[PDB]
Amino acid sequence: DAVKALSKAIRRTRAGLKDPKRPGGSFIFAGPSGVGKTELSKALAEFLFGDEDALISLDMSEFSEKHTVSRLFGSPPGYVGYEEGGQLTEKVRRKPFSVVLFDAVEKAHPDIFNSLLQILEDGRLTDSQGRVVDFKNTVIIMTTNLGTRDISKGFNLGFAAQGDTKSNYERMKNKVSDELKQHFRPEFLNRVDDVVVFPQLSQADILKIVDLMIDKVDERLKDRDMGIELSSSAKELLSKKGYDPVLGARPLRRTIQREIEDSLSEKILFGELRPGHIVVVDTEGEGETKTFTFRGEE
Amino acid sequence: SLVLDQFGRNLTQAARESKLDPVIGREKEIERVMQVLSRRTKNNPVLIGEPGVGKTAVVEGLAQAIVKGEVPETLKDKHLYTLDLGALVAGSRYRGDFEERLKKVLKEIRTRGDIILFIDALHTLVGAGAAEGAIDAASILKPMLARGELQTIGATTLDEYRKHLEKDAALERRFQPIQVAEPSLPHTIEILKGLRDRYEAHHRVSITDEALVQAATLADRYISDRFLPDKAIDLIDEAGSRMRIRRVAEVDGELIAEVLATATGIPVFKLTEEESSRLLRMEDELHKRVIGQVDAVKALSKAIRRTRAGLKDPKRPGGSFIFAGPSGVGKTELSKALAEFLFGDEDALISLDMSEFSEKHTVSRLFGSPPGYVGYEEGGQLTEKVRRKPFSVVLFDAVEKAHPDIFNSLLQILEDGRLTDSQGRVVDFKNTVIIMTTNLGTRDISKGFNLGFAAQGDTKSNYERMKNKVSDELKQHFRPEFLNRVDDVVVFPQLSQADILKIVDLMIDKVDERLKDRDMGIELSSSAKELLSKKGYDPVLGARPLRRTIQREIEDSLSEKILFGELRPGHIVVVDTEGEGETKTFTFRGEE
Amino acid sequence: SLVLDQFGRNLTQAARESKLDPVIGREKEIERVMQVLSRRTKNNPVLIGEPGVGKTAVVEGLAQAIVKGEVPETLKDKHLYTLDLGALVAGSRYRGDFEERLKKVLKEIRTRGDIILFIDALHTLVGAGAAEGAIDAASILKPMLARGELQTIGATTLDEYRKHLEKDAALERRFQPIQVAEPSLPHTIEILKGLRDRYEAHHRVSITDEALVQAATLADRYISDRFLPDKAIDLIDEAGSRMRIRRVAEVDGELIAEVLATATGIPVFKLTEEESSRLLRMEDELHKRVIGQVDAVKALSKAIRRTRAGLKDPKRPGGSFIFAGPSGVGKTELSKALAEFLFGDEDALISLDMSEFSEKHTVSRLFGSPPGYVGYEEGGQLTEKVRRKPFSVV
Ligand SMILES: Nc1ncnc2c1ncn2[C@@H]1O[C@H](COP(=O)(O)OP(=O)(O)OP(=O)(O)O)[C@@H](O)[C@H]1O
């Protein structure tokens, strides 16, 4: 859903139909942690500009005090730091076509939202210099992790029926939307183009993430003339071990670094796996007592 | 052209003499410069970009192309002169001298016609002669730039352009800005390939392709305050200089890694037979100081040998650990031991006492003051400490005693491995090891059990009961995402009698080291050690009470003797025990 | 060179006259400085370190090495000149005077190729030129530094390197920073042994072997705001000066301990028989003010005796006590009596009334305000008191 919404916004902007008074897109991502809210922003930045480092990312946890708005506006006249403008405004001014990202926007001071209302409707912002900076060609994304304690709990009080993947997502979406409505001002939520709630990851989704993570590990290994290959049973075991229906794909990464990366490290240190070799990982055993086996070939 | 070259340099002649380094991959920027130079009005561009990206290299390549004749017919043979500001001012002592010098130069430009001016520090043009003469060296240049009969090229960084040129709206519209971007990795590799031949002769060496690739990648990854085309170049230059000073004379990846490791201190050099010093031996080295905590030592050793043996996540710190458990079990001792193992001295640890962060605003001690507020001139303390020493061990002591709205600032450090200074600078934490020590879910262990009837239970059961309670306390205290971005959570079991009997040896060795300054020593016969371990077991307070015993049972008595003159330098004290029922005698005898 | 001699000082000639103190144990720093200097494009090293770790000593050792015949090629017979930057700006009354000096000296450097410039306090290079219509020396020196026709060695402390040299990134990128680390204890011992011969001659005294170890250890342990290679030298030199003012001459560790005790106030000097007897009768001395309460007086006496006997843990306070009791039994009187016995009276006690600390947000009275808040420069109230008097009773 989020990919479709983002692609629709990009296509609409590129076809000469987007509103010339507002930014190209305004999205609020919400849901559990480790689902891929930040990964989508990096993927979009890499698609648009060819490199994920072209993303203007702000960590809003550093804006927990009301007097830190000058960090993105600039100091008032006559004060220290007037020679340097707002950190965000200069970056946007140099690159009018860019992607702006606000991580954990709910952890910042409410006064921060005071600024965003100018961007989301008027599409321009004014710094202490008196200059006006336009945001009409940017894509604004706010990632939010609100109400996440309830997802960890799961279900509600009572005799809830045996539900499917549809019901759980609907309940989570309702709870997250209610939390967003309660926490934020009505004006801010009214001006945002899209509010996308990321559903949980399924067991089938985990296998492809295992493939990607093992590809990353192989990329790391290629720097020393080395490679890794996994059988289907190994990937199945990894998906079984690393599945967590609450915390997302991070437990899978921890499992991969604990079961595969560590043993590879001792084997490399011991001199078993010299450069110019390939590591083959397979499974041995049955039931819950299955164990990975590592072998070296040329 | 005497007035020209006596106040400038002929870049075209230098290019004809092949005294300029080759320029690679700047075809688009040079083409845009030539495009702008051909405009009817306002035909003078200015190159803006971060320092070190090669803004002057674009003009160098333009001069080389003009010499080689691949330029449009509108340029063809036009001499490119770099203006030497300051040489104009070097003699303008009397009134109206800098002005006449500049007017003579400009009239020469008009008469000869085929000259392109290059002003390196264009922001220094404003107020070059703002003296009693009161001309500013730019108030008179404005009409020519406006009409377009004078063609110049400028090259200033973004900050200087914003601070100086952007103030004057008049000069703002006379120039056309051109962005010069930082080259990517393959572009830097091509640049290194081109400059390799030139760099061979100076150092009389040979450089491999693998050396170039390694230099580019390592410069991109491990150096943070410099920009890409320069870091690879100066790494190659320093490696060549090292190889030359050492004297086939060839450089490769290992030499580049050694140079980079020496420069920054990050251990990126090759693995010699010291890999045995960490394989199967790091745990023993740690256990020589920390007794009876196998899980945490194993986790730390795994993390260190993972980050040393190649594969490791290049976007996240080396490891992140939460040490939980009872009081006085060795949580801080393990961090100190790890710091000593890694750096040779426990003073290299970067420790933060979180008990001083009980208030929300104290977070400014990590970041620094925001712009326009007092104290903004100096940055955050933690950020500066990490920036000076990229590879270090950071400890957050008594983590639970700080305000909950503090660790929100740790979210980007743990997952993304960076922290943004209040001045806008980014400091990377990707080479550090983060340890957080806590004491949550422990206050009730003094009595045991929760309430009501309970099962039989044993030592394993009590440990399992404590672990779940600590995990629940952590979950209800920390946000789920913060615990999600944590590599390991390690719970420390309480110490046992054998652990105390082993710890008394370490404490007695410390007392012996204290006495060695004034040329004495101590013995502590085995029965005395066993009795000392017997007094002060107390499996609720860890190894601290035992220390108190050693304080009040040994080093008091010795002190009295030292004050009385009973025992002097050149003697040692032998301690033994007497009696059976209470066996509490601790007889001291002084012998040479 | 006459042109250079007007503004600057020749380090090589001074080293040839044995007017520079010997430099010990800085092989790695000198090696890396020579490594950077023999480069092609940016051979301009800058030494960054703490104020006192011996940055200038590294350069003086480099001068002694280059005039010894013990340096690699492309550096033999080079001449190190320390540039002033004070005489250059002096006598720059009219426009185009300061720049004229730099152009002249730079042309002299170009003509005489075997010259290396050395600039103390490189941070003042930026902006050193002038206000109004005059470009600074940094702008003049930028073209030559980047291309590599002017070797230059700079030296700044970390704070001033970060606070001044980092507002001009274009100038900063033309220097390769080298970090000079504070020496360890054995390295400090070696440095003291090396400088013992030079420091004996000025005072015409003798320094025993144990005195160096005592000075190094005591300076490393009991002085906080200074850095190691300087404080031990300060101790040795001041002891020598003291005893020559007192007057074969021999300086032993006891003089060092007495000098440090006088300087800081912490009693580290040797125990006399009178002092030992007083410490043994401390209980009777304290009972002249407090009647009864034997256990507390005994505990305090035991703590003080551990401190004076040299068995105190060097990482923790001398003693920590909780006096719990009813009203009007002598809890505060005992503290006042201990303070009077220790220093000179009950007025030296650092007393804090916890009745004022009722609100949990009053902790700032111990620390101070965080950066960007009112009262930030005042500092802590307890921390300042303890820093002024390291040996006190809180
Ligand atoms: N859909 C996905 N596809 C691939 N990788 C994923 C996906 N979701 C999560 N990951 C992986 O999870 C890790 C972190 O995910 P990410 O940062 O995108 O999560 P998030 O939603 O931003 O979480 P948080 O709430 O903690 O900010 C990365 O290793 C990333 O590759």
Ligand SMILES: Nc1ncnc2c1ncn2[C@@H]1O[C@H](COP(=O)(O)OP(=O)(O)OP(=O)(O)O)[C@@H](O)[C@H]1O
């Ligand atoms: N395209 C390129 N091809 C070859 N070498 C290059 C290129 N770009 C930069 N360099 C090299 O990078 C180094 C520094 O570049 P340069 O001096 O042009 O930077 P600059 O942008 O003018 O920076 P500064 O702000 O210091 O003036 C030089 O050694 C130069 O040869």
Ligand SMILES: Nc1ncnc2c1ncn2[C@@H]1O[C@H](COP(=O)(O)OP(=O)(O)OP(=O)(O)O)[C@@H](O)[C@H]1O
């Ligand atoms: N396993 C151990 N091995 C050696 N010494 C130990 C051990 N555990 C505790 N100690 C000793 O106990 C004293 C204090 O222990 P430490 O500072 O490590 O405690 P901690 O676990 O961090 O406790 P707290 O929760 O009070 O911070 C030190 O003298 C230390 O040497």
Ligand SMILES: Nc1ncnc2c1ncn2[C@@H]1O[C@H](COP(=O)(O)OP(=O)(O)OP(=O)(O)O)[C@@H](O)[C@H]1O
């Ligand atoms: N043991 C004692 N010897 C001499 N005078 C004593 C003794 N105990 C109390 N006093 C007298 O008590 C008065 C003050 O008592 P002090 O301040 O020591 O009380 P305290 O025990 O600290 O009680 P509180 O703080 O609860 O009021 C003085 O006049 C002091 O002489």
Ligand SMILES: Nc1ncnc2c1ncn2[C@@H]1O[C@H](COP(=O)(O)OP(=O)(O)O)[C@@H](O)[C@H]1O
């Ligand atoms: N390696 C060394 N060997 C001998 N003496 C040294 C060494 N390093 C420093 N010193 C001494 O320590 C003192 C440090 O002074 P100085 O160099 O001015 O400090 P800074 O480097 O901070 O300017 C000098 O007087 C010098 O004699």
Ligand SMILES: [Mg+2]
């Ligand atoms: Mg995220």
Ligand SMILES: [Mg+2]
């Ligand atoms: Mg340049």
Ligand SMILES: [Mg+2]
């Ligand atoms: Mg601790």
Ligand SMILES: [Mg+2]
């Ligand atoms: Mg009282």
